[PDB]
């Protein structure tokens, strides 16, 4: 995976370089000499993460621009997968935001402590003397704690009164909440909570844009540095402003920079959400609604110029059920068909609302956003394949099989695919009976066309014909390797991770290294 390695190494370099660079820009130069004695080394430790966060804060919103990335795919296979790790990149970039935010916050806790301590004559003489600046006219403070409130109440006062402190507290709460509600448990069991509380990025970014507006972290100005030679003027602080050589130094603060970094990504994400709104408005007529047993309804629907590839999924917004939310459902229909369909299991409040609106128990207004997902158009490339689906993961394989029949009837000569072995791993066929009917149908079409050998499928019950218990992968791989010698076998699976590791192990173990042997090529959804 050289491309994603390289992105992470450029990204991590451009964080390490920024850390070291904005560390040394606030540590070495004599512009920050006086501020580095009031704040010590904890100044640069606070400002290097600031620039690192500036860079990471653009890099978070970009990969989650799903409509812009849809347009970029439209403008456009391993590299396609690598650029489909946008969510993984988002995750790690947000995690390193958390790291650098922790460093920034800790260093600023040190800064606030040492800026209240010096203000109340509880530090070394020089820092206390430096905190005295800014009290009177014609002098700019260096210590941003101005009221003589003793610690630890003084630090709290600065937090609840300084704009930087208030915004930092707010956006740190809004970041911790995002992180804690973006654990796999919430992102996979209560995705409603994840998506709602993950919309604190707006508050995070609004607070972050105005975070550095006060310019409290101040360094000595260029003109002051020109008139105020520090190596001469450091030890004569008690008489500053009272000799020719040493005027009172003037400290200004660096103008806010974060907005310059983040407006591009925020503009791009708002554009993304406007494309999503437009996809919402784009009309989608629901041609037919079959309700397969055990509370699953399939929506045959037609939208203006909708193109899709096998294995892709669409988000379905129903304004009547829910105005804000988008619910993804795997496309279960072949690209050739005029209508694109999805099967929805009625397991929750939004699907139940769609069920009631459809009238299965007039039709609801639904909106379709994007044929997103990783295209599985390479299934047809190989001469033999092993389609494996467990539980709910079998759904995209339905669309794959439907498209296989269309490629067999339309061309029958350009179909590189020759053989299907399908394995379905469900506790019971209690929610996917339509898929069972699908497999019976495809077997029937193969038998009627005098090509019954095309599709072989077995159903296994964890709790051809259905079987009990998990399949013996060792024996199955050996059997089909004996069946097909010196040909590539593409193994496709959508299911548990342990199952994926199992299939990887058997694929490597049963594959022959030489080109004159059988190669088992595993692909995982």
């Amino acid at each position: 995976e050289g491309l994603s390695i390289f992105v992470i190494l450029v990204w991590l370099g451009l964080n390490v370089f920024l850390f070291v660079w904005y560390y040394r820009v606030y540590d070495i130069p004599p512009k920050f000499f006086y501020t580095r004695k009031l704040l010590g080394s904890a100044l640069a430790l606070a400002r290097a993460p600031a620039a690192c966060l500036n860079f990471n804060c653009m890099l978070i919103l970009l990969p989650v621009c799903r409509n812009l990335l849809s347009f970029l795919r439209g403008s456009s296979t391993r590299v396609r997968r690598q650029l489909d790790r946008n969510l993984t990149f988002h995750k790690m970039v947000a995690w390193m935001i958390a790291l650098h935010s922790a460093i920034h916050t800790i260093a600023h806790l040190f800064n606030v402590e040492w800026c209240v301590n010096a203000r109340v004559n509880n530090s070394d003489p020089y820092s206390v003397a430096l905190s005295e600046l800014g009290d009177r006219q014609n002098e700019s403070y260096l210590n941003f704690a101005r009221k003589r409130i003793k610690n630890p109440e003084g630090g709290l006062y600065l937090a609840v009164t300084l704009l930087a402190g208030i915004t930092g507290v707010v956006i740190t709460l809004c970041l911790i909440l995002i992180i804690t509600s973006s654990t796999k448990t919430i992102r996979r069991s209560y995705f409603e909570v994840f998506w709602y509380t993950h919309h604190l990025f707006v508050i995070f970014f609004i607070g972050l844009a105005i975070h550095g507006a006060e310019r409290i972290v101040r360094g000595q100005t260029a003109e002051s540095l020109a008139v105020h030679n520090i190596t001469v003027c450091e030890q004569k602080i008690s008489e500053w402003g009272k000799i020719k050589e040493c005027p009172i130094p003037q400290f200004a603060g660096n103008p806010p920079m974060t907005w310059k970094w983040i407006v591009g990504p925020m503009f791009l994400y708002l554009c993304e959400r406007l494309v999503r709104f437009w996809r919402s408005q784009q009309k989608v007529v629901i041609t037919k609604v079959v309700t397969h047993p055990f509370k699953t309804i399939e929506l045959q629907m037609k939208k203006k110029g909708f193109k899709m590839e096998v294995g892709q999924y669409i988000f379905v917004k129903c304004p009547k059920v829910s105005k804000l939310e988008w619910h993804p459902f795997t496309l279960t229909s072949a690209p050739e068909e005029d209508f694109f369909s999805i099967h929805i299991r009625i397991v929750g409040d939004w699907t139940e609302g769609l069920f009631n609106a459809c009238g299965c128990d007039k039709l609801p207004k639904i909106a379709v956003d994007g044929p997103f997902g990783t295209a599985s158009e390479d299934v047809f490339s190989y001469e033999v394949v092993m389609l494996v689906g467990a539980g709910i993961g079998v759904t995209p394989f339905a669309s794959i099989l439907k498209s296989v029949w269309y490629k067999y009837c339309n061309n029958a000569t350009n179909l590189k695919l020759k053989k299907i072995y399908f394995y379905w791993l469900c506790r019971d066929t209690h929610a996917f009976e339509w898929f069972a009917d699908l497999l019976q149908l495809l077997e029937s079409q193969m038998q009627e066309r005098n090509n019954a050998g095309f599709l072989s499928y077995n159903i296994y019950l964890t709790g051809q014909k259905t079987l009990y218990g998990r399949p013996n992968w060792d024996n199955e791989f050996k059997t089909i390797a004996s069946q097909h010698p010196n040909t590539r076998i593409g193994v496709f699976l959508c299911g548990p991770e342990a199952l994926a590791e199992t299939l990887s192990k058997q694929s490597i173990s049963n594959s022959e290294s030489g080109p004159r042997g059988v190669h088992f090529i595993f692909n995982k959804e």
Partner: antibody
Framework: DVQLQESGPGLVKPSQSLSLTCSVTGYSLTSGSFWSWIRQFPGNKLEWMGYITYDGTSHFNPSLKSRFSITRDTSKNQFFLKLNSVTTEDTATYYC????????????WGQGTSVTVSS | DIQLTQTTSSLSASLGDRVTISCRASQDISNYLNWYQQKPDGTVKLLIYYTSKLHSGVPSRFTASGSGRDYSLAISNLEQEDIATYFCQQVFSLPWTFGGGTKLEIK
């Protein structure tokens, strides 16, 4: 060390102009300090009159309208008080002082000159 | 102009007795108050600046302390050279207003 003498007319007439000289010996005005002219009225009531900085900048008490001004003779190492249109209330003991601290404290004061205004 | 008021216009005490001279500023001054001692012959000399910093050269018995508006000068043990008027001056905002003064009379 540094010592300040005030020298000037001890009895000016009302509506005249008062001109007081402060001679500094152990320090030069251009080397650096704020050189004030605090005066004490009868009844022991001090008020900051106005200072001239080392750079030559001079700042006045606004209670003194525009009737008060400070100049200096750096060659002779001395600075001067100049009150236009002196009134009867201008009678006071004028102390010329040196202010070398960033805390604006007058460490060295003069002995003072008692200026009287009467007809 | 900020008005510095010394409530004690005149105070009496004995030798070797603690005396406190307190003055209050009409507006908050950021510890920017200085203390001067004017001898009866009119010689003024700085005692403390910034409300705590003892001017190099005056006896250690002069200790001053205060915050915000209220400031005080304390002398531990009195002798005959402490007969003098004591002024508190701000330097926080121009004009640098002085205090009323406080004469010390030994009993």
């Amino acid at each position: 060390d540094v010592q300040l003498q005030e020298s000037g007319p001890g009895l000016v007439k009302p509506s005249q102009s008062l001109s007081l000289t402060c001679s500094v010996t152990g320090y030069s005005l251009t080397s650096g300090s704020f050189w004030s002219w605090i005066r004490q009225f009868p009844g022991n009531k001090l008020e900051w009159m106005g200072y001239i900085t080392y750079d030559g900048t001079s700042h006045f008490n606004p209670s003194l309208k525009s009737r008060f001004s400070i100049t200096r003779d750096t060659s002779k190492n001395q600075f001067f008080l100049k009150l236009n249109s002196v009134t009867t209330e201008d009678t006071a003991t004028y102390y010329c002082t040196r202010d070398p601290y960033r805390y604006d404290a007058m460490d060295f004061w003069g002995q003072g000159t008692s200026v009287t205004v009467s007809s | 102009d900020i008005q510095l008021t010394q409530t004690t216009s005149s105070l009496s005490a004995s030798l070797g007795d603690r005396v406190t001279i307190s003055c209050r500023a009409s507006q908050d001054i950021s510890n920017y108050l200085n203390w001067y001692q004017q001898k009866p012959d009119g010689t003024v000399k700085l005692l403390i600046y910034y409300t705590s910093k003892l001017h190099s050269g005056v006896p250690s018995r002069f200790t001053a302390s205060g915050s915000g508006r209220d400031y005080s000068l304390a002398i531990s043990n009195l002798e005959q050279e402490d007969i003098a008027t004591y002024f508190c001056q701000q330097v926080f905002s121009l004009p640098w207003t002085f205090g009323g003064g406080t004469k010390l009379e030994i009993k």
